Amino acid sequence: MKITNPVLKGFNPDPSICRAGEDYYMAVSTFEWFPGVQIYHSKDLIHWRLAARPLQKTSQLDMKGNPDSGGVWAPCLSYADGQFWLIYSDIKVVDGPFKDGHNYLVTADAVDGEWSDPVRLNSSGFDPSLFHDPSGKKYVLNMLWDHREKHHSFAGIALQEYSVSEKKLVGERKVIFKGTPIKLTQAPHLYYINDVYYLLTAEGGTRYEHAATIARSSRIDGPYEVHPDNPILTAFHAPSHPLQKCGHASIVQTHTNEWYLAHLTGRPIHSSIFQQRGWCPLGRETAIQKLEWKDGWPYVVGGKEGLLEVEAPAMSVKEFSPTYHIVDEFKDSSLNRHFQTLRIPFTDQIGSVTENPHHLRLYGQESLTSKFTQAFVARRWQSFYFEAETAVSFFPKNFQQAAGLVNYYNTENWTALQVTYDDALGRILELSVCENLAFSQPLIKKIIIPDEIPYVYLKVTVQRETYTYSYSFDQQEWEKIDVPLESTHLSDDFIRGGGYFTGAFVGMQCQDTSGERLPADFKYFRYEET
Amino acid sequence: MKITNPVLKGFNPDPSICRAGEDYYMAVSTFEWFPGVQIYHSKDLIHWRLAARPLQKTSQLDMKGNPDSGGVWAPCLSYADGQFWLIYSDIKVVDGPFKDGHNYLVTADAVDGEWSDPVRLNSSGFDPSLFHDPSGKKYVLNMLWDHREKHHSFAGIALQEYSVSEKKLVGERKVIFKGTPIKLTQAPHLYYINDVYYLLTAEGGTRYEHAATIARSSRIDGPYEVHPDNPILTAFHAPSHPLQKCGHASIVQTHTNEWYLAHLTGRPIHSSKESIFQQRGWCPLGRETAIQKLEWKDGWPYVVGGKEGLLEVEAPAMSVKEFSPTYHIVDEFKDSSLNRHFQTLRIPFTDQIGSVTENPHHLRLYGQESLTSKFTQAFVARRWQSFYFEAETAVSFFPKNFQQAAGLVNYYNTENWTALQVTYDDALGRILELSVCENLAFSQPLIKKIIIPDEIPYVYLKVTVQRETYTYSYSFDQQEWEKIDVPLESTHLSDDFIRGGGYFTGAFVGMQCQDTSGERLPADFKYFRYEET
Numbered sequence A: 001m002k003i004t005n006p007v008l009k010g011f012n013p014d015p016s017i018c019r020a021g022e023d024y025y026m027a028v029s030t031f032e033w034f035p036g037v038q039i040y041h042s043k044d045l046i047h048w049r050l051a052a053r054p055l056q057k058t059s060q061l062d063m064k065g066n067p068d069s070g071g072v073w074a075p076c077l078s079y080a081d082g083q084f085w086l087i088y089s090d091i092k093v094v095d096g097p098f099k100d101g102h103n104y105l106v107t108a109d110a111v112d113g114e115w116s117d118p119v120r121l122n123s124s125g126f127d128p129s130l131f132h133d134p135s136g137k138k139y140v141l142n143m144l145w146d147h148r149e150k151h152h153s154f155a156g157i158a159l160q161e162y163s164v165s166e167k168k169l170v171g172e173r174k175v176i177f178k179g180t181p182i183k184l185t186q187a188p189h190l191y192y193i194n195d196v197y198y199l200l201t202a203e204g205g206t207r208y209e210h211a212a213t214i215a216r217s218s219r220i221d222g223p224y225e226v227h228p229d230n231p232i233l234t235a236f237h238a239p240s241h242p243l244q245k246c247g248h249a250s251i252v253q254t255h256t257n258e259w260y261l262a263h264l265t266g267r268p269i270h271s272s273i274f275q276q277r278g279w280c281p282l283g284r285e286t287a288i289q290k291l292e293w294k295d296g297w298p299y300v301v302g303g304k305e306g307l308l309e310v311e312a313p314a315m316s317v318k319e320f321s322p323t324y325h326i327v328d329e330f331k332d333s334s335l336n337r338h339f340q341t342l343r344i345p346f347t348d349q350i351g352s353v354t355e356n357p358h359h360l361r362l363y364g365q366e367s368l369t370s371k372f373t374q375a376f377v378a379r380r381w382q383s384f385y386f387e388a389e390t391a392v393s394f395f396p397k398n399f400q401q402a403a404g405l406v407n408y409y410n411t412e413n414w415t416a417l418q419v420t421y422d423d424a425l426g427r428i429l430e431l432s433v434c435e436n437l438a439f440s441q442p443l444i445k446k447i448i449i450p451d452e453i454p455y456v457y458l459k460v461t462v463q464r465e466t467y468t469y470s471y472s473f474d475q476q477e478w479e480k481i482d483v484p485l486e487s488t489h490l491s492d493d494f495i496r497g498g499g500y501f502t503g504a505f506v507g508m509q510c511q512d513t514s515g516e517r518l519p520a521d522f523k524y525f526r527y528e529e530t
Numbered sequence B: 001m002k003i004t005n006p007v008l009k010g011f012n013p014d015p016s017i018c019r020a021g022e023d024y025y026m027a028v029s030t031f032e033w034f035p036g037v038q039i040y041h042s043k044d045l046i047h048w049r050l051a052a053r054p055l056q057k058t059s060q061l062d063m064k065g066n067p068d069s070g071g072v073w074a075p076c077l078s079y080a081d082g083q084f085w086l087i088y089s090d091i092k093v094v095d096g097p098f099k100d101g102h103n104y105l106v107t108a109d110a111v112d113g114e115w116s117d118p119v120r121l122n123s124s125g126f127d128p129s130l131f132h133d134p135s136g137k138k139y140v141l142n143m144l145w146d147h148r149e150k151h152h153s154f155a156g157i158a159l160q161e162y163s164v165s166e167k168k169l170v171g172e173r174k175v176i177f178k179g180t181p182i183k184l185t186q187a188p189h190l191y192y193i194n195d196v197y198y199l200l201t202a203e204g205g206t207r208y209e210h211a212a213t214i215a216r217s218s219r220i221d222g223p224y225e226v227h228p229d230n231p232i233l234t235a236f237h238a239p240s241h242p243l244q245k246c247g248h249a250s251i252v253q254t255h256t257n258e259w260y261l262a263h264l265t266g267r268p269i270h271s272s273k274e275s276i277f278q279q280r281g282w283c284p285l286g287r288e289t290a291i292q293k294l295e296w297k298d299g300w301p302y303v304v305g306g307k308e309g310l311l312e313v314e315a316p317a318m319s320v321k322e323f324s325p326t327y328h329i330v331d332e333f334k335d336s337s338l339n340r341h342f343q344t345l346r347i348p349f350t351d352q353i354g355s356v357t358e359n360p361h362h363l364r365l366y367g368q369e370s371l372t373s374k375f376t377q378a379f380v381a382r383r384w385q386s387f388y389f390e391a392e393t394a395v396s397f398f399p400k401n402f403q404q405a406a407g408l409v410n411y412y413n414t415e416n417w418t419a420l421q422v423t424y425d426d427a428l429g430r431i432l433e434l435s436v437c438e439n440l441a442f443s444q445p446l447i448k449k450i451i452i453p454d455e456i457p458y459v460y461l462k463v464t465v466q467r468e469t470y471t472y473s474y475s476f477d478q479q480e481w482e483k484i485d486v487p488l489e490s491t492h493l494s495d496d497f498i499r500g501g502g503y504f505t506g507a508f509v510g511m512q513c514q515d516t517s518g519e520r521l522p523a524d525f526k527y528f529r530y531e532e533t
């Protein structure tokens, strides 16, 4: 068969691919969304199933208060010595001269097993990677962040030995590579192939100038000579290409002795090589390319920009059963694996799937602008065309209580259709819009909800560059809210600030900024792509 | 003797004054600085001593990650039924349409005692106050925050009964007061005086339009009639007055049957190039606390000397009780507890960031995150409390990479600070570096790097603050001081200069170490001198 890119749809950046026998695994970054890291599994490189989200405890990942697009940046998943190794970061500062953030290591015998508590590695820069040297030694690579005024912040690739027995980095750290003229060198990954060390890096930054670079040396600490046709991957020069932002790659040699490269990519809604390259409401997604070797150097098959259709390896086609319900009626004892919360775990602080059977109950907490405790359960936008739908029982008694359907990028960028209370009108349906923290409520006439309506049905219809909300009081006749919203406003390319690394989500939310923790009961959640 | 204002100098805003027999207490807000809430004590209203900081545990106050000028906003301290009651806030969102934050109550039998773990009250707006009605019932008041687009955000004063037995608010909440045209109505305090309810509020916001408003009613839930000469306190109309931003007041009746009003105020530095009517000034010492005397006419209080406040106020008829200082001019860290004038940012002082016992007679700080981090900073600091002072320390620090730095810092928030630090250059060895962060614009303006010789065990660091400016100097033998020729502006560390929706603290000076490599490299500070004129 063939591989159709992207193989991971919607917000799934920074792919780290690894092999264990005939099983393939890919870890992707999750930023402020909890639980942390997503790990997918494949047996053919075509089809991938969401298999685990390892960082489930605050003892592993504590992100209350983390800035937007802080938290878990690029992870590294490897398999060696009969166990899985996961290297990850928790970034606490994403703007200004510093980038305060810590790198950790956890392990497990299976990706869906219990993962260990973390070992502190270092804090000296993001994109940490663990290299299992053929000698048996272990090394941690990461980019080096340089805060100093007269130095480029992307200071090169650092290497330091990791001692398994001491559970710490040991000895001296070395900068083994300063990068090519594209600069912004990061995402380091070492490979030892036919007695040669290959250093793979990302360069150019994760916007439309993104690229993958490779270099090689006979010693682990260099010096490294760069690929003669570098970069091996980039879509910068091809603004019409369906895959953009191609970079941050990792390499796997399959058990069939074939060579593939996983990388992140974005699929924009377009608007010219140097400006107006589009908007990516689905964020950064993951693609896989085939590699071909010539004279000890790898080349992406088909050219530097990547291909939508890639020759699949010589493996058995293996598709997995879907891992979410088109209509989740909340019959399971825990939330389906495609739902995430912001920053904190799903506990009785914010909600319950057992208090009211067959409902998700959310106790109203802080607003959508809060980096702390939000009663908000959401899942990724993973198509340009879908409807999402919910039914909510909510009886607010003051104007500080609201619950309903949300489409969300970060604390400053979201829209919400919520049942709330107005002292003069009673229970009402209100549309709130937050655009880089500029707040508007654009319905001139509020929508009035009769007291006798037990459930308010809420729907969002996403149709590429626009989406629109609708509602119903009986689920048969649907009223459309004639305010068309721009999908591009929920995109990496629109929002302000240093962190622009996630993607659009849709979910169920309740807020009560009066203090009463008033519950909202959601009967089902439908997510139906086209 | 007279009361000389401000009675609490430097960053000491939102004063809540209360009487316990013949002892007087005032609680002030502390925002992101930890431990939370400062309580001062007085026996004559002239002299005040720092008595306690009640919120010492993460179980009472957990602020890791809080925005700058979030955290503990205005507190309310009362004494009733033989115990102290402290209402406080933890604000989590300080920008945009929402102001997410929660209000809590804790109690204690003495202000320096062990305070209880908190009772949740509400989240509906800040400036919570607890009122002890003569009937024995209790009520919580606070401002009501309105996030809706078309509405003024200060939606009025809410009132709701508190049940001591159920440890929760009960019954209906009511808006009892909507304010005056000054708007931004906040800081509610109720008083029951001669069978009339007096509602005191702040209005106009805490910059130069700040004012104190008072209203009265026969019933606790109103409606309330406004003072005929409202506001009773403001300097809005008097740009040249030495006290500015006067508002957020509280009233005490002394045991001598005299009446006083505590309020916050700023003492701005002015520019000669600007009109004081257009550029009202810059306050590096933040919002401070003053006390005015009250007189009554026709059932309304008035501020003695006029609405603007006095610098020198007639003291009540009590015996003078002066206190000795509560900090050492030269602190040599011989004690195993940090002196009470030192605070940390957001988190408790533990082994995570430092120790005074690991290396005896030194403050040891383990390098952690940068000064721009809202999470874990190894930074111990105290308030600027004079326009003219010297602060000095001596640091033992042997950095091995450029991500390690330790030294003397002057600080307003994560985006506004300067630091003179021992650090490491790959081509020069140990150097002394000056870093400047100004609304997150970062510079290191020293042209020629200052090499530190390997044989120097301690580097001595000094800042001289002189109203509009301040300047760093250094020494390798503590005998001769060397100039760092970069003049710094004190007004850049002030409420009036920093950007963003939280502008509520004041400048601090202290000792800091960072290691953004991960090795938690320690810096040992031998002493900390803070010497005002």
Ligand SMILES: O[C@@H]1[C@@H](O)[C@H](O[C@@H]2CO[C@@H](O)[C@H](O)[C@H]2O)OC[C@H]1O
Pocket (backbone or CB within 6 Å): A013, A014, A029, A073, A074, A126, A127, A186, A204, A205, A206, A207, A248, A501
């Ligand atoms: O670490 C991952 C990378 O893909 C990328 O890292 C860089 C962080 O700073 C940004 O300004 C750069 O453009 C970006 O390449 O994004 C963060 C994380 O996804």
Ligand SMILES: O[C@@H]1[C@@H](O)[C@H](O[C@@H]2CO[C@@H](O)[C@H](O)[C@H]2O)OC[C@H]1O
Pocket (backbone or CB within 6 Å): B013, B014, B029, B073, B074, B126, B127, B184, B186, B204, B205, B206, B207, B248, B504
């Ligand atoms: O709650 C205290 C008040 O003194 C004051 O409250 C208001 C907070 O929002 C600002 O925009 C207003 O100007 C201010 O008056 O400041 C915070 C805290 O000290």
Ligand SMILES: O[C@@H]1[C@@H](O)[C@H](O)OC[C@H]1O
Pocket (backbone or CB within 6 Å): A398, A399, A400, A423, B173, B174, B175
């Ligand atoms: O009118 C008041 C309203 O504004 C508040 O939200 O809840 C209680 C009511 O008394």
